[model samples]
Target: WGNLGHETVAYIAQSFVASSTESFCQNILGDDSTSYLANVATWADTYKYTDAGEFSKPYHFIDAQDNPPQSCGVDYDRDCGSAGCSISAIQNYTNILLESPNGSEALNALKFVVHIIGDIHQPLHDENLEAGGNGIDVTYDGETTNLHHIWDTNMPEEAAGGYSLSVAKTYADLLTERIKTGTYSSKKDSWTDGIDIKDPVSTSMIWAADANTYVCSTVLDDGLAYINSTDLSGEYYDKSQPVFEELIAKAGYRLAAWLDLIASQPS
Candidate 1:
């Protein structure tokens, strides 16, 4: 996902959390803390460029088949492959956050947990074929790129109605208002419910599987072919806009719920 997409999720999640969780997060972040969760949400991505981040490369995504010849859904053993993939990384890091002492270790875990949660919600992050669409070259709005980058950047920017991070914040604010006072006003509980609060790993898996389902449907179903001067407007953009918005919203609410669960646990 793009930086804005991750930050948007952080912003929404912060809104839905208890103040104590926010405080705990701030404490974990220490001197690195900022005014909002979104400020620190991209820390994991930044850390990936450092020498110590080499072991975390695989934690950013899974290599699952969207629609395998043998099955239709994601299987942890088959999809996650090694123990260090995104699924186990989330579970392990979450456990570290919940069980480790209040120190740098827990802070590290907190960063990974926040980042992997966002990663699992990005449709292409859970896919295996085409190297998660990295190989499917296309020209989106005159820029030569691949399917993965389109999902990460172009679609999200279009959904938010602009390319700037401020635009994403504005869209997040609007969606928050809509969920609070508009058509979706009555459905906040529905969006936040269904996770097994006792099983964070399973919950993360469910989210990963949900994201992968979209890979074959919303992402690759029509846009997989090579593109030449495809403006990224018209039907494709229109159809993709809602999916981008919904995924962003879901990641936000789920991150909030997960944090609430983690913070509220007995320390």
Candidate 2:
């Protein structure tokens, strides 16, 4: 996920977290500027290349081996690298938070958890072919881009009315409205249906699988031919707005629960 989607995810979770979850987050982050999850949502992306955070680069997403446009699957054991991957890192970070670590450790774990959860929901992050859709170039409304960029940057920014903290906040509020009593009202509960942080790997797998399925259904429904042929900023982009919105909404819903569960437990 990019800044826009990541911030939107954090904002959405902020709207849904419990008092204890909020307090724990604020205390761990330990600053007025970092009090809001959205403010710290992109921390992982910011320092991913630095020596301290380099090991966590793979924690953002897994390269699932499933064949898309025909099939898609997430066999964690098979897909994740030897260095570890999203599911493993999520479970590991969750363990760190569960133990109630000190300020810095807790903060890092919290930020990574929030960011990685958001990343996993973006379909291409779970994809393997074409460098997770980064290799192949495509023209998005005359601008040069790729399939992964179309999802991570172009479509999401456009759908959310362009990328800024303000826009993300508003988009989050709109999605929250849907969760509260609008379009997603009925499906909201089920979004967190199998949340069991005790089995964090399996818990996160549910989300990975959900997002991966879209690769076959809509992402690469016709492989490169479909993606290259369409003007992603127009009708193709139009149809994907709903999917991005729903994925962000679900990531938020799941994140709030994930954090709430972590907050409720701890040594």
Candidate 3:
């Protein structure tokens, strides 16, 4: 359904928000707990919000499959797990600039890092086939829309009924706490260890799948799995919030780890 505009949806999701409040929780607050891994998670959440504030390209909303060279400069079609498009784009951008060292590009890359961190929290963005949930479709408020749009915006906002954005910052703080669940000493070790890549593709592939599936099919996943439409009042939404919260937390921690690595490296 075209009921809500894309920008409206993106704006809505900005509310479902990442959690960052637990960064200073007692577990990791002491000097003895100052591990490189912990720092990385801290940084990813910080950067994601930073990026969300500055980067507003519409291309980032779509998948990487159809974009050829990649629209968001990340890939979603491979086994990089949640690290595919958003993570790759950050790493790739960082690596290239590490060689030349330009102020503008460096600044842009930092913003990208922030936005992509949020992107990774979106389960749909991590899909290996069919642009994740982008192809899957279901009716929201009697309107038709694809899965990507659903997760990226509709479902969460609808759960809150326009009040979503108001509490986005709260959710972000909560998620920040959840992400630091474990402890680690090395940023690289933390990131590399957590990411499970069975296969890999480019950011271009991420967008391609999104575009191809948008019209081709919208009700099923890779194995033709149907999109769940078990609830209308979003009572189910209440049950599902914890699951998503955990994901947000995980994404925040992981994003922090990545940022710590880059931030610690000599400039």
Q: Which one wins on TM-score?
A: 2
Give a tens-digit lDDT track for model 2, residues 31-141. 545328999999999878899889888888889998888889989999998999999999989999988657457888988999999998998888888878999788787
lDDT of 3 at 258: 43
Ranking by TM-score: 2, 1, 3
Model 3 C-alpha lDDT versus the unseen true structure = 0.39
Encode model 1's per-residue lDDT on 1-267: one tens digit a residue.
878788877777877888888887887877434336776678888888889997788888888865632333677777777547888887788787778738568877887777778888898888887888788777777777887888888878777777555776787786677666764678666765457656766788888888777776777566433233365556767777777777777788788888888888565
Two-way TM-score contest, 1 vs 2, winner: 2
TM-score between model 1 and native:
0.88
TM-scores of all models? 0.88, 0.95, 0.49
In candidate 1, where is summed lDDT lowest over 10 consecutive residues? Answer: 223-232
RMSD of 2: 1.8
Give the distance in Å from residue 199's predicted Cα in candidate 1 to where it truly belongs: 2.2
